[PDB]
Design a protein around this ligand. Sequence first.
Ligand SMILES: [Zn+2]
Ligand SMILES: [Zn+2]
Lengths: 42, 148, 102, 90, 100, 196, 56, 56, 98, 116
Amino acid sequence: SFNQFVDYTLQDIICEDSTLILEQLAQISRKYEISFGKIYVT
Amino acid sequence: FIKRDRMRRNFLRMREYNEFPLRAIPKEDLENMRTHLLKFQSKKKINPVTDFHLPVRLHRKRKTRQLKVLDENAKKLRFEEFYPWVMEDFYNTWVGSYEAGNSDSYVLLSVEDDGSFTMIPADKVYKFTARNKYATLTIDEAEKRMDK
Amino acid sequence: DLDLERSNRQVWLVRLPMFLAEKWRLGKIRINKSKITLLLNEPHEYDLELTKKVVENEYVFTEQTIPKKTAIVGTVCHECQVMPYHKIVEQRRNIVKLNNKE
Amino acid sequence: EGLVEYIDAEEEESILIAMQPEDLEPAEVDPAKRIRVSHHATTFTHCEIHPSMILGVAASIIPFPDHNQSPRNTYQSAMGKQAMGVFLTN
Amino acid sequence: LEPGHAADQEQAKLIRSAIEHTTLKSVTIASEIYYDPDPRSTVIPEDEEIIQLHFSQQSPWLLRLELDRAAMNDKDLTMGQVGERIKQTFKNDLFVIWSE
Amino acid sequence: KGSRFISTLQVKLYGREGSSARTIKATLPYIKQDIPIVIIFRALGIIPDGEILEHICYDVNDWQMLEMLKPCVEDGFVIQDRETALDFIGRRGTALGIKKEKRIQYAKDILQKEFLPHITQLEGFESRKAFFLGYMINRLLLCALDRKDQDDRDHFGKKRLDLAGPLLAQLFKTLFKKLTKDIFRYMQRTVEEAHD
Amino acid sequence: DGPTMREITETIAEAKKKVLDVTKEAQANLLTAKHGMTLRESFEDNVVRFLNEARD
Amino acid sequence: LPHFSKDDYSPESKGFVENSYLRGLTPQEFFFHAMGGREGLIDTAVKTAETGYIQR
Amino acid sequence: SLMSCISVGTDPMPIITFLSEWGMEPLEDYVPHQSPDATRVFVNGVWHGVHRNPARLMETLRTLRRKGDINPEVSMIRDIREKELKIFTDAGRVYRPL
Amino acid sequence: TTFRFCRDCNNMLYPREDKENNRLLFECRTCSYVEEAGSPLVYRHELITNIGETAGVVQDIGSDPTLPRSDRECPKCHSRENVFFQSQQRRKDTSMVLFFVCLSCSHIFTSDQKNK
Ligand SMILES: [Zn+2]
Ligand SMILES: [Zn+2]
């Protein structure tokens, strides 16, 4: 279980919420996005 | 009949037809024109729109930084086209629907004016149903009627 | 003002394995009788299957409360599907179930 | 090689497990031997690797458990957890 | 048991029915709902014979039902008491005629 | 995979044995009350009564299931249009979708999204959702007609064991979620206040 | 005793025959449950009663 | 058990042990005796819960 | 039990994909009257269509599992009397060798 | 039972009291399509069950692994190999008769001596 979880599943949870986007108007507007990549474990 | 240990050394002891050439139709129309599959549930033999009626018209029918739910664009674009396709006269009626099960991997064999074919995939599929042919509906009286 | 070119064009739609599906994103029909056979282009030779000889109330249209330029191609004469050469396909099928991730 | 299969509870519903391989798989006396059933049935699909393996970790240590009143086995499995001994070599 | 009527096999069987709840559905097999054009004459043949027996303006529905003999013959009874019971249950409006 | 919804659709065979009103209501999530299922068949897009039964009683010759289906069918007489049913369902649960043009579209939201988090959570497969529902009510009549035993829920095949892997996962799933929300908060204020 | 063990086996075996006949009788729709219990209900009674009798 | 064909009401299948503690039980028999033995434990646990409470 | 092991769960995608390529008639196009004797196919309790010759299908599957084409932890059950074929790849099932 | 349906409308047909011709019609409550009644029967309840007792028999039932086997003959087929099972109606009141499956003429005979 633990090895399977560490190897495969742990990457999944990162994937489903990797990105969150933020936008604010101007006076053309601008928008900000933060995204997650591969997971690395020491 | 008891346990054993000394069997190991035994292992050491054991040791006509119509060829129609094809070609993908050019892509500029594919940008402008999207092709889909039409289907009916009339149970009719053909149910051709030729016999349906004339005319025919088929068409669909200060805040700060904020956490917004996400969605893949094609679904998001598909989220926006929620208007049902409707063909009418100005009296028989037809309304389509999305199936999303077999619009993915299909390329059709258009047997064109020439014997050869242009092979065309399907962008979408739609399920048009004959509706209101008997033309009865009680959307408002139903709530009262259910008490009898 | 929907356009109807013929609405009687025959089409033989086919379900294909992804390996066949992805490769098309020519043909040589050697119809034999009901021993339907198909000569693929070069690599294997996979025949056609009589998925359903007659298929009704299904039609092909194209589109270009606002309508668009809608044209109708025709009807599915016979729903078909590829008959997967096959040993390599079976080998490919076994190979297909042996992928992985990073 | 596909000589031994993996089976869960649901899969057990639709199989026919023979108890001991040579006891039953081939077709066809000391009274002190325990009386067993025969292999009248033929359409088997699996045979138990060894019936004694249905026990757990604590239970397995019981000598001749099939010669005991079953709740006694439970008691031994309980105490066996608090048996003074040597738990690790370090 | 009754003091004098003790150790009497048959006498006990008399009482056995007397208290035992006997639902009509416990003997019925099936119920048939028919349309009969004549209140007197019935399309089915088995119905016509009994009619003149109790004979010699009514709804054209027909209700017929079937019961098991042995289930009846466990708590043995007669349909004659059944019918008047049914009659006296609601009224003599529900014209009921039963097989013997 | 994904938020591990705890949506537990239920089917209720209303009406006791013998006594009338042997109609069957379901319970879609996020809905005020229970709903007769024949609406859902229309709601998912099965208008005629014959199609509804064909989605449940897979055998034509068998009729007792159809017999028990008869009352619930007539309970759906009041609706003959999917949208009418759909819009009506939108009324039936948390109707705060004040715009009626958005109130009826709320019904399609629940069925697509909140209804059966398994077989799909995209759009279009509404027919497939019906069949599973139609299959589900096929089982219920069978048990109600005593051709199958009551489902033993102590059977081990119906059990699953969650080891350290999944136990960490779901526990980690939430912990990671709270991390993101906090990162949004800091991300909001800097955009809010042009800070570093 | 060897004899006693053998006699035991006869006792167990004779019980099976009692069971076997009753089993088939049920399969021939012959067994008649007395008033107040089902056929299977009655069928189990004789079965269990035989085995307990046999052991005792 | 998966070791039996369906519809086997014979005593060795429905849970009658014919062997004796002197010469051990067969698995199918042995496993059954576990359930029968267990049922007492649960009951004895319950009686400690119930009888103790009632007596109070 | 000493032989017991717990399924870690796999991706069901290959099977379902493989199923379609071996005559599983898709459910969206299923017409029960037109195929009265169909065999419903489930995957982790998720109906994905019907079939018409399950016996051909079944032993074909097990061979793949025994070939190692299908991961051996994947449980699959053919229930003849119910006209139903089930497949499981869930994580957390309890399985033993045989 | 065995109730036809509408056409171009396809809905279940309620009965309609045809008194003038003194018969029974069947109406589609969706569209006014109406046709007669095919049988004088209207409704049967059938409190006791005698249908579905023989469920599961197909071309492949006898190829089941776990069913117990037997050796009696199939009467018409005169073949003395068969497979069998218990009554498929899982109801307590049901008797414990047996049903057998031929493999030669696939004739499905019960084990009853009372009424064949
Ligand atoms: Zn109609
Ligand atoms: Zn025969």
